[PDB]
Chains A and B, each alone.
Chain A
Amino acid sequence: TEHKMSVEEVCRKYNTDCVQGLTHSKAQEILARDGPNALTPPPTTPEWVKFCRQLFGGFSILLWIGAILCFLAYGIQNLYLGIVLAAVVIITGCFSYYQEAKSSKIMESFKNMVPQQALVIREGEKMQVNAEEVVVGDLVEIKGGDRVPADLRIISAHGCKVDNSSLTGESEPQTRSPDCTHDNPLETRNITFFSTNCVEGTARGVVVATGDRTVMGRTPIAIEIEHFIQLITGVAVFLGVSFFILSLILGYTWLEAVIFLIGIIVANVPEGLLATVTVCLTLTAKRMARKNCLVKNLEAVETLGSTSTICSDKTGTLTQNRMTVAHMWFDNQIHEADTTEDQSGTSFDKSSHTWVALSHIAGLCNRAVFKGGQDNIPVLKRDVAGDASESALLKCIELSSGSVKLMRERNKKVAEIPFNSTNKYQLSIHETEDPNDNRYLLVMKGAPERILDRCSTILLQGKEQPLDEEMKEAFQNAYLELGGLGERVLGFCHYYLPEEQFPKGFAFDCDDVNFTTDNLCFVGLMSMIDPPRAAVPDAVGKCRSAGIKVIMVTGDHPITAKAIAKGVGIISEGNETVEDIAARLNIPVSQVNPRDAKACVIHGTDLKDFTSEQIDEILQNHTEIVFARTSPQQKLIIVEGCQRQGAIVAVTGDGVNDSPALKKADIGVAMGIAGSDVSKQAADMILLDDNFASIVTGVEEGRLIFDNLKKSIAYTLTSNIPEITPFLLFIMANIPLPLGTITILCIDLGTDMVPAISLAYEAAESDIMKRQPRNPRTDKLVNERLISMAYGQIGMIQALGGFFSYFVILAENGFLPGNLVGIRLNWDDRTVNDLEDSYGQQWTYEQRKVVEFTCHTAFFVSIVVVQWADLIICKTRRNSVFQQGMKNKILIFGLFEETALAAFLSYCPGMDVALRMYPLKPSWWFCAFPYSFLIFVYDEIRKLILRRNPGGWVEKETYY
């Protein structure tokens, strides 16, 4: 709303000085009045609305009404059904809330874990500070690859293009100019809209509106689990309805039949599987974020466990990105920079004016400062703002020169093009220091071999020398020598503009280059050793053993890329490329057979002329690949071509131009301390530190999630057979019912649903990173092996333990197992009060029912006893408990608490009139001990067999 008029009145309106900006004192004065610069969030629920949404909402209001009706019906004269319904709804809702109020709380932390920064200029200084407290008056600075903090009225643009894609939605980047073009604020050029990314260039603007008064202020795993749950619920409803009808045919007064139906339905379905899955994913996301590994979505957590390819750049990721200069090269003499403070060695001569010209070419291209206030701090350890190679050259020069800023102020640059990866040249035009020859200096910076072709002259021991063919060979040999040490070099050169040809008043154009940049001289080049990170070789080894193919897509010379790959371990020992093989055999590289080499180095220039089939065969017939001197568009090329053979490729990027590669790749990894906001917001994963060992740690966590989820699902599923078999035998064999509905609820909504959470805290097994990555397509969370192991091997033993306990109690009270068959008709008959047992005694109805309910209670206790061992054996699926240990205390807490609940339900007085649970004698607690021991021994033996011979029949048909 201020684009129409000039800058002087807009800047005075907000009490801003265009050169300086706003003072520090006024900043808080305006901040406390206006408030933070952030859009108002939607209103939050009072934290009790969702509680009632999960208890009284959904398909549970019907159950609540039924429970109320049953309670009323009992009051006027039944109670069992009301207790069952109330317990089902209350426990299910409370558990679903506890796991939903935890995952939401954890995910709320990720909004502020990484901050949003803006480059404001206040009191003649630019500081990177949080963008929330952006006042409506200060002067801000935006650079290509960043997003604007608030609405900006551009005052000084440098060919900055801003892509909106938020109001118009068009991805076409619109340029920004300081002059007015349209009176319409929506399509003018002075105004930059809020929350829009700046693609290219750099512009400075004055903020006119912050916060609400702005233009904008006016998983596969869950799907699979849901499908399985729906299938099992359909089967459960079918069985329950069928057996309900059968019970009505037998005759059970329409209320014991509803109780039977509820028991069957509760027994056959897992009531807390989905919330368990969600909380597992959330807890592992928090665990991953505790380490320097942040994930935006929960789908990236489900992925990253099947990663099979990592395409990581070189600097910053595989190296510390703090380079100290090591070697130089000029006058055909390989010189090394001695960084000692006392200037020991005296290996290099400083008096030669070749070195002063070297400082005059490599000393003023850098955009480096020291924040002004540094005293007593050595120049080596002084902090700098800028790049690494930039200000590494300054650490080089400042040991020789004695003016950080005085000599840079002595001259002044008229031309400036920011260094860009694709263009690769850094140009600036500088005035000569000579008072008699005040010519215009020209500077170069970039790849030494990319600039060498731009030079036909070279200084040598003081004076320029013409283009020598031997000089090119000497340069190549020096480059090879410096790159063989795992070092990156920068080749730069200077040329004086002619004094008479170019008048000393000419304006230095930026877009249309008029200065001659094709025939310059050549000063030299210097080395900038960047040692690799400490924990990177171990991570590369872990990737190598885990079947993850690491590809390096760097942006510098092939020799230094190969050297750093060899140092890191990307190119393993004993593996050689075609050129090294040819050099060993002294054979022309053309006739070298390519099947004898498994490592290759691909130049970026050759990659533009390679077709899709050539890329596919390069990726397929090599195992150790590097891509040297490539651009992010080529990074998209490799990312696209590497997943065409069934790979889940994760790529790393930080620039603005890397965004399509990050979006195309399965897992896009941004950088937390060196990445632009565009890449940071276009990725599914942020490295809080750029280490490449955090990528491997995140992959390990992604692998661990699957193991823990499989263990929890198997343990939850095991206890479905012993809760449905008793009803099957109650009608097939005509025996007294050995499991009631409250007991079934205790087995299912108790020891099964809740302790399954404790398996999500299990530590990673020993061989977690020593096996091939899982296949997202042919490998599923729930498979035939898991169903087999749960429903036919462990569930059957648990059912046998429960039935053994039931028979023990029935036989010790008089009814031997011989004449229990066929007694169901008379047993459940209320008109028979003289039922004859094995020894000849006669029982009243309520005297048999007490024994039956004690049998129910000890069936519950025996299920708990066997599930002790079932939980123990589910800790590991490949290793053994004896070599795993009882590390996590949540599991032992769950064991003790489920046993405490079991021993409290039976023995608490007054529980034999509500839950129909009766105390059981101490001797009956040891009925299921043999079967629990059998479960433990059987799984120990099976896992030992599995470990001894991999790939055998046991792994083929039992390894779930």
Chain B
Amino acid sequence: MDPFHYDYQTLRIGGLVFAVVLFSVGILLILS
């Protein structure tokens, strides 16, 4: 409600999940 607090540590979790997904997809692709 207040435009002075952004919900970090939730963006960080999403970014790390996305990076892990990309890394796993690349590793699986090299193994195909």
Contact = CB atoms under 8 A, between A and B. Distances in A.
A–B touch (CB < 8 A): the answer is: yes
Interface of A: 889-890, 892-893, 896-897, 899-900, 903-904, 906-909, 919, 921-922
Pick the 6 closest A-B CB pairs, nearest first: A907-B15, A896-B26, A900-B22, A904-B19, A903-B19, A900-B23
A893 B26 CA distance: 5
B31 to A, nearest CB: 10
A889 B12 CA distance: 29
In this complex, which of A899, A903, A909 has the most chain B Cβ atoms within 10 angstroms of its Cβ? A903
Interface of B: 8-9, 11-12, 14-16, 18-19, 22-23, 25-26, 29-30, 32
Nearest to A894: B26
Nearest to A903: B19
A889 B23 CA distance: 14
Contacts of B9: 909
9 contacts: A890-B30, A893-B26, A896-B26, A900-B19, A900-B22, A900-B26, A903-B22, A904-B23, A907-B19
Contacts of A919: 8, 11-12, 15
A922 B11 contact: yes
B3 to A, nearest CB: 12
In this complex, which of A893, A907, A919, A922 has the most chain B Cβ atoms within 10 angstroms of its Cβ? A907
B7 to A, nearest CB: 11
B6 to A, nearest CB: 8
Contact of B11 (A889, A896, A921): A921
DSSP majority for the A interface? Answer: helix
Nearest to A909: B12
In this complex, which of B9, B23, B26 has the most chain A Cβ atoms within 10 angstroms of its Cβ? B26
Contacts of A921: 11
A900 to B, nearest CB: 4
A898 to B, nearest CB: 9
B11 A893 contact: no
Contacts of A907: 11-12, 14-16, 18-19
B12 A896 contact: no
A903 B18 CA distance: 7
Nearest to A895: B26
B29 A899 contact: no
B16 A908 contact: yes
Given A896-B29, A907-B14, A909-B9, 17 more contacts: A889-B30, A892-B26, A896-B22, A897-B23, A899-B22, A900-B19, A900-B23, A903-B18, A903-B19, A904-B16, A907-B12, A907-B15, A907-B19, A908-B12, A919-B12, A919-B15, A922-B11
A890 B11 CA distance: 30
Contacts of A922: 11, 14
A899 B8 CA distance: 21
A908 B8 CA distance: 12
A919 B14 CA distance: 11
A772 to B, nearest CB: 38
Nearest to A921: B11
A563 B12 CA distance: 77
Contact of B29 (A892, A904, A908): A892
In this complex, which of A893, A896, A909 has the most chain B Cβ atoms within 10 angstroms of its Cβ? A896
A470 to B, nearest CB: 76
A897 B20 CA distance: 10
B19 to A, nearest CB: 4
Nearest to A918: B8
Nearest to A897: B26
Nearest to A911: B12
Nearest to A896: B26
Contacts of B15: 903-904, 906-907, 919
A893 B16 contact: no
A10 B12 CA distance: 85
Nearest to B12: A907
A32 B19 CA distance: 58
A909 B19 CA distance: 13
B5 to A, nearest CB: 14
Contacts of B8: 919
Given A900-B19, A900-B22, A893 B29 contact: yes
A904 B20 CA distance: 8
A890 to B, nearest CB: 8
Contacts of B23: 896-897, 900, 904
Nearest to B26: A896
